[PDB]
Assembly symmetry: D2
Homo-oligomer: 302 residues x 4
């Protein structure tokens, strides 16, 4: 198994580090800037030795070293104009070198960039995905667990839609070790105002990390990606929210959007859960924005 | 941190093995049969070396080697003969390691956790039995199989005895936060299929026995270890375990399988709002545990 | 997609399954001849997996045809004469069902039984091995680390070849510092080291005499680490039963020796021995050769 | 109740936190002088924790008094003149707030900065150390394993001396699964010229990473620190090369320098192995430089 990291910045490097700790595969660290992937590859090699990992690591500036890659993680970029061009190029490269790879897009804007990759990849839509939902879900589930003074380990939630202010958090589909969130407002352990406070924090978390750390989150995104890698390689069928190809699900077809999905051997597959009309309405507006910003994107690339 | 296994049979040995794999603490393997814990201790030590674990392991037949234990895992036994064994372990824990968190495993479980309380005189929050997590594990695994998904995020509350008056709450079953109800709506699983799964979960212990000619060992050990983990690392994880109810679910002054958080200071019950058919099934379960527990204490004299 | 087939679902095979699940090595096929035993243990491992968050497929079966295209084979099936018959049958089954699997034999007597597997499997010799040396090495390295009041983690040793072990003090080191340096500084004695050697020689029997059962956890861990090295193309250096082909003056026999395991199987390594280092080993290699031909004769 | 206090929340300190979370070593305090950085990184590690099922508490602070009663201290604070300023202040703070912590200094120049910390903390000398040898050892053993086409897992080596240009790698104390390196030169599987090449690479590895990645190694240093943390907390007695207080060992007195040591409950304890005269010579001269640059250091700080 060869895991190709297209982009060897902060997120790509920590994905490699975590793919080594768990023995997921050999690493290809690719970047456009000479020297950066070679230096980080050497560091990961010594890290590997210290911790008893024997996987192969190669830092390269030559994209043809992506050949027969089973996994692809795209963080290449720095936005809609400059990253879309980069994403188109990587897309073409993935077609002629590693057409049978499972592809996890990360570059922002996410839901826009996953569609750009699809249009120019000619890859199957089930073999393509973006990571967003798991990061929003984790922040929401952590904030709920803190207030309920419980471990986050068994706090579960569905959050539909794009990675931004077009989130759709489903309180209906939130549970604490199988006990719905409702049961906790019932027992006056949490209030609806507190839950809506938590939702806006979840919506603003990306910007809050940036304002404090003067840099976008890296560790949590890397962990989300690694778990999507894991799900695919080990045919796990785990249920995530991800950018995924809808095909009639939630009244939408022919667009990658943040949705519920299974990841396994054959890729990322949407799941349709029964929504209210206010749940499906908010989501359709969310899906509409992604549709308009994606076609503006395709045109700006001209 | 010293983790004391009172009973070095099939389950106790795998608890040690798993607490070594995760570096939970030093092990004291105690048993009544001479030589058995010493032999198994040596094996776990070579196992430890092979995989790079440095925790100390001591196999002994001397119960006084239980002193200052932080964790206690009781598998000692084979209602009459195990309850009198459990009384002895209880007394031993009283004078040697009174401030230990205690995880009872010996069967019948909810009966034996009460036996331990009566004779240990330990605080009620420092005592527990493992049952619910093992039943929950079989139920959620069977649900995940039918729904063609990973079990990893299938969660469920199961109240009551570790037996054939289990109370599985379909209301409190969810798949990555989505209630099971949503899956019967979309016809991905049926109510009869779910009642299949319930009778299977109730009969799994006997089916393992009837197939393997031995009671389950790995899954129980894993359930115990996760309760050990929750306590040592102050995790506040939400399990179903045997726990001291005191008004919760209309029951007071009895250990029974219930919802609880485990942390630093022990095992703490949580009362969720049940229907009356949910609370009725549970109260009858709680009634049997109360009747068999007083039956139990009687045969021990 | 990686399939790990356990031929034998007793104490060792069950713990090998458990450990390959904990480490996500692959899907499991638990095979046994006794009806119900692998099905029961498979169910237990499934619930164990759920508790610990492992998603691998688990199949308990009594039909050997379910071992098809297995990448890994772990043979614990048995109970001298009668285990060889069992091993011959397992060998034939592996050629018809899973001919390109890497094969780790465990059933005793070990060096005799892996040779039995070779004669009847028609498998390549590099794809076959038995687990022994790692268990003797670990016990020796554990006892040394205890005496030196050090972690075992970086105590390494070569032991070639039961009563016919070859512990090489010259090839013993503590994080790269030879054992030599520790007797120099009066931290351990030559008599202490020879006591430790005999404890290592007698460890199997005393575990039996104390626990009234042969070791299971440590053997399972040794096997899992050979499984690991093969699947992840690790090239780790073990002592195991391995096919010698001129190495150490011996050819055409599986014997306990130094080997690297990788993608391509188990491959002997020849280190430079003195002459009674090689002399003692040649007697050991002679013992395995006579009892192996004794074995093949008793099997008819 | 184990508290791991990271004094410095840059690249190395952040990955130390991440790795002590993956292994459940303790709760984290991320301290830094720059407002917002530790708070932001703490949030990221918290969400990282949720995704991977870790429940240990993490707090990012700009208030140094928040390291109180810490069991572990990892000092990466800095950027000889100005970092000695920082290390003296950190030293004083550790004295009055967490005097019984085991202290792992990382800021460089390492062997110089560990002595600075000792002078102004007055902590017990067995409770103070710097991480260097394990990073040099890993690079050397990695390069040896590559040549010999073997797993690095059982390549072991002693490297004495400063973390710089006068390292002292002991081929005598190099072994492959217990077999000395010499046995491989006999078998013509490696040459001494190749081994001296490997030594020059090991000596220059830090600068080579810098020139390629335009940033110092982070992953491997963090892993070295974490395993030193591990050895201490779990009373492991593992044998490392670290900066440690020698007092008569190797003809050296009253100075922290890279040497062989056991780490356990009670701290870091030197071990003296029998060296030849060429081995002890090369070591005394490195030890001489560390002494001269440490005396330069103490003078520059006033
Ligand atoms: N979807 C999420 O939830 C999540 C969360 C936070 C950030 N983001 C986004 O993920 C992306 C990655 O973040 P990061 O920390 O890794 O950024 P980074 O700067 O640290 O790394 C990006 C790398 O891509 C490289 N690059 C640029 N052009 C390239 C090309 N044409 N081919 C190959 N490589 C190329 C850059 O040299 C750089 O090394 C960012 O756009 C960020 O905004 C995603
Ligand atoms: N709580 C649950 O959900 C659940 C599930 C499975 C098993 N069980 C029960 O857990 C118990 C242990 O299972 P096991 O496989 O490990 O049994 P085991 O026979 O293999 O080990 C029990 C050990 O306790 C020893 N022992 C006997 N008397 C003793 C005494 N007076 N003091 C100390 N030790 C003593 C025995 O010699 C034996 O070594 C069984 O009763 C089993 O039915 C409970
Ligand atoms: N190489 C070593 O260092 C070492 C160390 C310890 C044990 N051993 C040996 O490993 C072997 C297994 O040990 P164990 O405790 O796990 O044995 P076990 O009895 O507990 O399990 C062996 C299984 O093989 C099964 N079996 C029997 N006949 C079979 C057949 N014809 N086909 C398939 N399966 C069949 C048995 O039913 C049994 O379930 C023993 O021979 C033991 O002596 C080797
Ligand atoms: N010991 C070794 O073997 C080895 C190897 C590599 C790196 N280093 C050194 O380890 C140290 C850390 O490396 P890094 O990548 O993490 O550096 P970094 O710049 O990325 O992070 C250091 C942090 O210390 C902070 N800081 C600055 N001044 C401070 C003060 N007065 N008090 C508290 N904090 C303060 C900075 O804001 C910065 O965030 C560096 O000196 C590095 O050069 C040592």
């Amino acid at each position: 198994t060869k895991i190709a990291l297209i982009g060897s910045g902060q997120i790509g490097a920590i994905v490699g580090e975590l793919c080594l700790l768990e023995n997921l595969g050999d690493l290809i660290l690719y970047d456009v800037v000479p020297g950066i992937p070679q230096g980080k590859a050497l560091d990961l090699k010594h890290f590997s030795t210290i911790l008893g990992v024997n996987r192969n690591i190669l830092g390269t500036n030559q994209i043809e070293d992506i050949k027969d890659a089973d996994i692809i993680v795209i963080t290449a970029g720095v936005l809609i104009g400059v990253n879309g061009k980069i994403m188109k190029s990587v897309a073409e490269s993935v077609k002629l070198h590693c057409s049978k790879a499972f592809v996890i897009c990360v570059s922002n804007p996410l839901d826009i960039m996953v569609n750009v990759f699809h249009k120019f990849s000619n890859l199957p839509h089930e073999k393509i995905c973006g990571m967003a939902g798991i990061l929003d879900t984790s922040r929401y589930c952590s904030l709920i667990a803190d207030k309920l003074k419980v471990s986050a380990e068994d706090v579960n939630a569905v959050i539909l839609g794009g990675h931004g202010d077009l989130m759709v958090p489903l309180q209906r589909y939130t549970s604490v070790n199988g006990v719905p969130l409702s049961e906790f407002v019932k027992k006056n352990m949490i209030s609806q105002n507190e839950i809506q406070e938590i939702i806006q924090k979840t919506r603003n978390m990306g910007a809050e990390i940036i304002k404090l750390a003067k840099a976008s989150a890296a560790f949590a995104p890397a962990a989300a990606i690694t778990k999507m890698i894991k799900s695919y390689l080990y045919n796990e069928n785990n249920l995530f929210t991800c950018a995924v190809y809808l095909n009639g699900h939630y009244n939408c077809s022919n667009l990658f959007v943040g949705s519920t999905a299974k990841i396994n051997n054959k890729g990322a597959h949407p799941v349709e859960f029964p929504l209210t009309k206010e749940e499906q309405d908010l989501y359709t507006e969310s899906i509409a924005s992604v549709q308009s910003n994606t076609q503006k994107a395709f045109d700006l690339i001209k």
